[PDB]
Amino acid sequence: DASGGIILIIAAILAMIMANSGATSGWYHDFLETPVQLRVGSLEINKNMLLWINDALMAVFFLLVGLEVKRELMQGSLASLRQAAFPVIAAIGGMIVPTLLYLAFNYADPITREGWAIPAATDIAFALGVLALLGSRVPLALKIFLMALAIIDDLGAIIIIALFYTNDLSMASLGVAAVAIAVLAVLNLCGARRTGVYILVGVVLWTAVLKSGVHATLAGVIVGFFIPLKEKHGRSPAKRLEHVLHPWVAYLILPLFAFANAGVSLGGVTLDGLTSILPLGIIAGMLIGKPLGISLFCWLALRLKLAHLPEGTTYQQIMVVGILCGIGFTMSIFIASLAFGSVDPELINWAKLGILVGSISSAVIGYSWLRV
Amino acid sequence: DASGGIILIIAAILAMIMANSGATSGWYHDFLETPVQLRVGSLEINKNMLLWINDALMAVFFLLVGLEVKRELMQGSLASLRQAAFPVIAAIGGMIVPTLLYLAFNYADPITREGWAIPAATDIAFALGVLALLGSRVPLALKIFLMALAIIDDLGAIIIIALFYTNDLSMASLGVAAVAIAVLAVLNLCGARRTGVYILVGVVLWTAVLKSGVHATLAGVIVGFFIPLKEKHGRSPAKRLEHVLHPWVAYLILPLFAFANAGVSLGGVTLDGLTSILPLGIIAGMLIGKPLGISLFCWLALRLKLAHLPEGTTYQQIMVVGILCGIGFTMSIFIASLAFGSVDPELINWAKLGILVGSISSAVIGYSWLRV
């Protein structure tokens, strides 16, 4: 609702300018990479501080996203076999065309082919903030469709990334991870009505698989999928937790995150995007693949029978929302960092540059085509 | 005021039987001596896990105690206009005689002289539960007097321990701690009704002085002091925080601490506390010094018009309330652990044995003299 994306923009530009002209030598290059090591007897964990920061922030953000999914799936839309045909078809369209277009001239080289899921990610706060500047010319249908599409897109991308092409972590880590989940199910079955116990068990589970990557992020979604929501005695823990967490994410979680990962050297940029395989695949994937991979499949779903277009919404609004949906920004940057770990910084820097250029271009094109 | 205390008793007996059992000491002893090292390339922190557990639990408990102190100082029993002379004089009495008796035998010996404040500490939850066991006709005045006396005694002992006979921290730690406090003062002065900001700044402060346990405990008290309480718009953050925190402290933190720090070994114990100087001094201070000192100084308080006895006391119940107040248990065990760190386990084991014996004897005597 409120235009809270200006804080994200100011944080991004502050991070971009901090890394140049006098700074970035004492800090921001020796910093954000100092190794940290935690040792308990034989057990030992070594990682960079940026990894810890990203893990914590994304764990919180995906806990919120899982809570939103649980609230939305049983109340409002997504409550029937036909009430969710349109967003599901839109997500299916957005999970095929941009990825297929990205891999057209990239899949030849494996080290860049591994990042096939970069353009499929979609941002949340930026698109809603962009919508916020329009005065009363924002139907509720557009907002509900946008969020219920981007959320499922991100969840599917994260699930697919976690399932395949993942390291085989220690069996002892999963031995205690397969018990906390069952403990969570037993606790929820008999009723708890206390978010503290659930949060404690979630912290235990998150620490269990902290040695891995995406699994730490997925722990938040798993935990948010289990907190009870059924209305009783005038109170509901899920709604209270959502209301409590909402201001923090838009002001402290998403900010201070774009301040860390975002920001490129921008010192030896030549040939614009270098016209290489990965920046071009990222730029074309989010600028053409998403607005075209969503509109066409939605049109197919808009056929006789199958899905029906929402009330107070025509194809033109669908196509502009599809244009806006081609924005990854922070989420796409995080996906790129996760997929390109233990890699020389040149690839990550080029991917971030391409993501920034594509997001800016898509946002300006979309805001240009809202009749004003 | 629920009964409680049974959880603490069962945790203590479980820890004792685990430690002294035939085939579980081999794991109980080794689990608490596992080193933990954290580093960021500099300022390495190496400590035993027991120290971390004690620091966290005591920080939370003392945050609650500081919140209670702030609540009761301006609108509670303490009130103003020096009308709360009785609890202050009682605390002054409890901070002199019990310490004097302890130091009588340990004056010459230098190594055991450090723990002069062992019997001054007073347990709150156990005494309150013992009182509530007979909660059929006991007046509220006795309960509030006991709680205020124990709280002020513990705070005075902890402050004196922190200020005097302490190590000196680094310049950077003190410099950081001198900015967070000023930040908290500015936040409170300018108005801030969100407890999340205060908790975050308190976490930063606690991490700043994490090197020394005493200052880590002091951080919680300071944070509880600085959180706003003034009534506005039919709500108060301090009261809500106290209500939220109350079930957790009496059900999770205290029993866990009791289970962690009550595992003494009953192997080769001869002549009770060997008729030594340290256990005998602890017993004399906790059993004889506390009630005699409390009663005597209360008598002098009444004598010279310094204070008037509260309603429904008649000085008959003051002796039994002092006997009940002569119970250290968890608090005295923690104080002994803090004072006797990096010392041979024999000394701390003997101190724990003496503390437990004195606490049990005082509790049974107090329950016997309450006329069943």
Numbering used by the authors:
A (entry chain A), B (entry chain B): 11 to 382
Show the paper's wording.
Na+/H+ exchangers facilitate the exchange of monovalent cations (Na+/Li+/K+) and protons (H+) across membranes to regulate intracellular pH, sodium levels and cell volume. Na+/H+ exchangers that perform this task are physiological homodimers, and whilst the ion transporting domain is highly conserved, their dimerization differs.
Following sample preparation optimization, a data set of 14,329 movies was collected and a cryo-EM map at 3.3 Å resolution was calculated, according to the gold-standard Fourier shell correlation (FSC) 0.143 criterion. Similar to the monomeric crystal structure at pH 6.520, an intracellular cavity in the cryo-EM structure at pH 7.5 has opened to enable Na+ accessibility to the ion-binding site. The cryo-EM structure of NhaA is of the retained physiological homodimer. One CDL lipid (CDL 1) was located in the middle of the positively-charged part of the dimerization interface, flanked by two additional CDL lipids (CDL 2) bound at the ends of the dimer interface. The flanking CDL 2 lipids form hydrogen bonds to R204 and resides in a hydrophobic pocket lined by residues W258, Y261, and L262 from one protomer and L197, V207, and L210 from the other protomer. The structure of NhaA in complex with CDL supports the proposed regulatory switch induced by salt-stress in E. coli.
